[PDB]
Design a protein around this motif. Structure first.
Motif, PDB file in Angstrom:
ATOM      1  N   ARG A  79       0.831  -1.209   0.000  1.00  0.00           N
ATOM      2  CA  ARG A  79       0.000   0.000   0.000  1.00  0.00           C
ATOM      3  C   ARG A  79       0.863   1.255   0.000  1.00  0.00           C
ATOM      4  NH1 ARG A  79      -5.821  -2.186   2.295  1.00  0.00           N
ATOM      5  NH2 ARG A  79      -4.580  -2.800   4.111  1.00  0.00           N
ATOM      6  N   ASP A  80       2.094   1.102   0.437  1.00  0.00           N
ATOM      7  CA  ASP A  80       2.982   2.229   0.511  1.00  0.00           C
ATOM      8  C   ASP A  80       4.002   2.047  -0.587  1.00  0.00           C
ATOM      9  OD1 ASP A  80       3.151   4.521   2.425  1.00  0.00           O
ATOM     10  OD2 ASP A  80       5.251   3.858   2.565  1.00  0.00           O
ATOM     11  N   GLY A  81       3.747   1.076  -1.455  1.00  0.00           N
ATOM     12  CA  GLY A  81       4.617   0.831  -2.585  1.00  0.00           C
ATOM     13  C   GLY A  81       5.670  -0.232  -2.322  1.00  0.00           C
ATOM     14  N   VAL A  82       6.467  -0.523  -3.346  1.00  0.00           N
ATOM     15  CA  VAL A  82       7.479  -1.556  -3.277  1.00  0.00           C
ATOM     16  C   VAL A  82       8.754  -1.062  -2.601  1.00  0.00           C
ATOM     17  CG1 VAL A  82       8.723  -3.240  -4.645  1.00  0.00           C
ATOM     18  CG2 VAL A  82       6.613  -2.331  -5.465  1.00  0.00           C
ATOM     19  N   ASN A  83       9.349  -1.922  -1.769  1.00  0.00           N
ATOM     20  CA  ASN A  83      10.771  -1.847  -1.424  1.00  0.00           C
ATOM     21  C   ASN A  83      11.306  -3.276  -1.245  1.00  0.00           C
ATOM     22  OD1 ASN A  83      10.180  -2.742   1.215  1.00  0.00           O
ATOM     23  ND2 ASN A  83      10.270  -0.673   2.083  1.00  0.00           N
ATOM     24  N   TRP A  84      12.601  -3.419  -0.976  1.00  0.00           N
ATOM     25  CA  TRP A  84      13.176  -4.757  -0.979  1.00  0.00           C
ATOM     26  C   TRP A  84      12.618  -5.631   0.138  1.00  0.00           C
ATOM     27  CZ3 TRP A  84      15.039  -6.154  -5.322  1.00  0.00           C
ATOM     28  CH2 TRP A  84      15.806  -5.279  -6.116  1.00  0.00           C
ATOM     29  N   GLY A  85      12.477  -5.080   1.335  1.00  0.00           N
ATOM     30  CA  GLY A  85      11.957  -5.862   2.444  1.00  0.00           C
ATOM     31  C   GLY A  85      10.554  -6.375   2.177  1.00  0.00           C
ATOM     32  N   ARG A  86       9.746  -5.565   1.509  1.00  0.00           N
ATOM     33  CA  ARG A  86       8.380  -5.960   1.258  1.00  0.00           C
ATOM     34  C   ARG A  86       8.379  -7.064   0.221  1.00  0.00           C
ATOM     35  NH1 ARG A  86       5.984   0.185   1.103  1.00  0.00           N
ATOM     36  NH2 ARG A  86       6.709   0.681   3.223  1.00  0.00           N
ATOM     37  N   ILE A  87       9.366  -7.038  -0.661  1.00  0.00           N
ATOM     38  CA  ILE A  87       9.502  -8.116  -1.642  1.00  0.00           C
ATOM     39  C   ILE A  87       9.890  -9.425  -0.953  1.00  0.00           C
ATOM     40  CG2 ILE A  87      10.839  -8.942  -3.614  1.00  0.00           C
ATOM     41  CD1 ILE A  87      10.838  -6.246  -4.777  1.00  0.00           C
ATOM     42  N   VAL A  88      10.838  -9.340  -0.028  1.00  0.00           N
ATOM     43  CA  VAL A  88      11.218 -10.487   0.785  1.00  0.00           C
ATOM     44  C   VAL A  88       9.977 -11.080   1.456  1.00  0.00           C
ATOM     45  CG1 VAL A  88      12.386 -11.202   2.834  1.00  0.00           C
ATOM     46  CG2 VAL A  88      13.538  -9.665   1.224  1.00  0.00           C
ATOM     47  N   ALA A  89       9.192 -10.207   2.088  1.00  0.00           N
ATOM     48  CA  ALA A  89       7.951 -10.586   2.761  1.00  0.00           C
ATOM     49  C   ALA A  89       6.967 -11.260   1.802  1.00  0.00           C
ATOM     50  CB  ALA A  89       7.305  -9.359   3.397  1.00  0.00           C
ATOM     51  N   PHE A  90       6.881 -10.730   0.588  1.00  0.00           N
ATOM     52  CA  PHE A  90       6.044 -11.311  -0.447  1.00  0.00           C
ATOM     53  C   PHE A  90       6.440 -12.768  -0.702  1.00  0.00           C
ATOM     54  CE2 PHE A  90       6.224 -12.328  -4.989  1.00  0.00           C
ATOM     55  CZ  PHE A  90       4.884 -12.411  -5.291  1.00  0.00           C
ATOM     56  N   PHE A  91       7.736 -13.030  -0.817  1.00  0.00           N
ATOM     57  CA  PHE A  91       8.178 -14.414  -0.960  1.00  0.00           C
ATOM     58  C   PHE A  91       7.870 -15.265   0.270  1.00  0.00           C
ATOM     59  CE2 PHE A  91      10.512 -12.797  -4.565  1.00  0.00           C
ATOM     60  CZ  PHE A  91      10.497 -13.882  -5.438  1.00  0.00           C
ATOM     61  N   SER A  92       8.204 -14.743   1.451  1.00  0.00           N
ATOM     62  CA  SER A  92       7.763 -15.347   2.704  1.00  0.00           C
ATOM     63  C   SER A  92       6.296 -15.735   2.669  1.00  0.00           C
ATOM     64  CB  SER A  92       7.974 -14.383   3.856  1.00  0.00           C
ATOM     65  OG  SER A  92       9.076 -14.801   4.628  1.00  0.00           O
ATOM     66  N   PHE A  93       5.462 -14.769   2.301  1.00  0.00           N
ATOM     67  CA  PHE A  93       4.026 -14.977   2.225  1.00  0.00           C
ATOM     68  C   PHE A  93       3.675 -16.188   1.361  1.00  0.00           C
ATOM     69  CE2 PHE A  93      -0.329 -13.781   0.634  1.00  0.00           C
ATOM     70  CZ  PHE A  93      -0.972 -14.078   1.822  1.00  0.00           C
ATOM     71  N   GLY A  94       4.212 -16.236   0.144  1.00  0.00           N
ATOM     72  CA  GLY A  94       3.966 -17.372  -0.736  1.00  0.00           C
ATOM     73  C   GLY A  94       4.374 -18.703  -0.118  1.00  0.00           C
ATOM     74  N   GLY A  95       5.600 -18.762   0.397  1.00  0.00           N
ATOM     75  CA  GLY A  95       6.091 -19.934   1.102  1.00  0.00           C
ATOM     76  C   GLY A  95       5.102 -20.383   2.154  1.00  0.00           C
ATOM     77  N   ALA A  96       4.625 -19.429   2.949  1.00  0.00           N
ATOM     78  CA  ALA A  96       3.621 -19.698   3.976  1.00  0.00           C
ATOM     79  C   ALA A  96       2.388 -20.362   3.393  1.00  0.00           C
ATOM     80  CB  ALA A  96       3.245 -18.427   4.683  1.00  0.00           C
ATOM     81  N   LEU A  97       1.849 -19.785   2.325  1.00  0.00           N
ATOM     82  CA  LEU A  97       0.664 -20.349   1.675  1.00  0.00           C
ATOM     83  C   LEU A  97       0.920 -21.739   1.103  1.00  0.00           C
ATOM     84  CD1 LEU A  97      -0.718 -17.248  -0.336  1.00  0.00           C
ATOM     85  CD2 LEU A  97      -1.681 -18.116   1.788  1.00  0.00           C
ATOM     86  N   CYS A  98       2.182 -22.055   0.821  1.00  0.00           N
ATOM     87  CA  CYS A  98       2.552 -23.403   0.383  1.00  0.00           C
ATOM     88  C   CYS A  98       2.632 -24.357   1.556  1.00  0.00           C
ATOM     89  CB  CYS A  98       3.874 -23.418  -0.398  1.00  0.00           C
ATOM     90  SG  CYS A  98       3.707 -22.727  -2.055  1.00  0.00           S
ATOM     91  N   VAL A  99       3.113 -23.877   2.692  1.00  0.00           N
ATOM     92  CA  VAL A  99       3.177 -24.744   3.852  1.00  0.00           C
ATOM     93  C   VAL A  99       1.780 -25.095   4.365  1.00  0.00           C
ATOM     94  CG1 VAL A  99       3.730 -24.822   6.282  1.00  0.00           C
ATOM     95  CG2 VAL A  99       5.527 -24.236   4.617  1.00  0.00           C
ATOM     96  N   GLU A 100       0.901 -24.097   4.483  1.00  0.00           N
ATOM     97  CA  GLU A 100      -0.472 -24.353   4.923  1.00  0.00           C
ATOM     98  C   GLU A 100      -1.180 -25.355   4.002  1.00  0.00           C
ATOM     99  OE1 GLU A 100      -3.267 -21.172   4.214  1.00  0.00           O
ATOM    100  OE2 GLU A 100      -4.904 -22.634   4.283  1.00  0.00           O
TER     101      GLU A 100
END
Ligand SMILES: C/C(=N\Nc1nc2ccccc2s1)c1ccc(-c2cccc(S(=O)(=O)NC(=O)CCCCCc3ccccc3)c2)o1
Length: 144
Positions: A79-100
């Motif tokens: 919501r505040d736009g892209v930065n590197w940490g948020r991209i990292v989090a985005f990958f984290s998020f996907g991984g999470a959805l794969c684990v669940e």
């Protein structure tokens, strides 16, 4: 990109391996971006993810669920736009959805979540990555 496709694939496979699930739904600077992103994701999960709203709470992932649902939840990371940490989090998020999902024996959803990530990364995040010197700058900023 196809390059990004293999990053998502690399990341999800690492994470599934790491957390104790099958990664077999999946059949130089690029090994270097992979590592840096791997470690980045681990550091985010270790130190930080604890602080944020569980975005997995806001997406009961199910066989009916489509890209727009996904997109609309990941949009909350940006919501505040892209930065590197948020991209990292985005990958984290996907991984999470794969684990669940594997934890919910919906093992087939994985590749689809990987499809969505590659779409989302390529449609919305890529314009920022390139502006900011691409993945080689991420590595320089987050290597080791
Ligand atoms: C809600 C959310 N993530 N939720 C997530 N849930 C899950 C579940 C599983 C895996 C990953 C996630 S990520 C979210 C929004 C933004 C981010 C984010 C991710 C990575 C990095 C960053 S960050 O580096 O940009 N840091 C911040 O956004 C916090 C900075 C706060 C500064 C506040 C301030 C105000 C005034 C003066 C100084 C500072 C944000 O996560």
């Amino acid at each position: 990109s196809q390059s990004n496709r293999e990053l998502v694939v690399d990341f999800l496979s690492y994470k599934l391996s790491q957390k104790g699930y099958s990664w077999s739904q999946f059949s130089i600077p690029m090994a270097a971006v992979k590592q840096a992103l791997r470690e980045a994701g681990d550091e985010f999960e270790l130190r930080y993810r604890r602080a944020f709203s569980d975005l997995t709470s806001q997406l009961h992932i199910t066989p009916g669920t489509a890209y727009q649902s996904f997109e609309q939840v990941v949009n909350e990371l940006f919501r505040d736009g892209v930065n590197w940490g948020r991209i990292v989090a985005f990958f984290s998020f996907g991984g999470a959805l794969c684990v669940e999902s594997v934890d919910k024996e919906m093992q087939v959803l994985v590749s689809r979540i990987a499809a969505w990530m590659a779409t989302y990364l390529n449609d919305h995040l890529e314009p920022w990555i390139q502006e900011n010197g691409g993945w080689d700058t991420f590595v320089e900023l987050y290597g080791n």
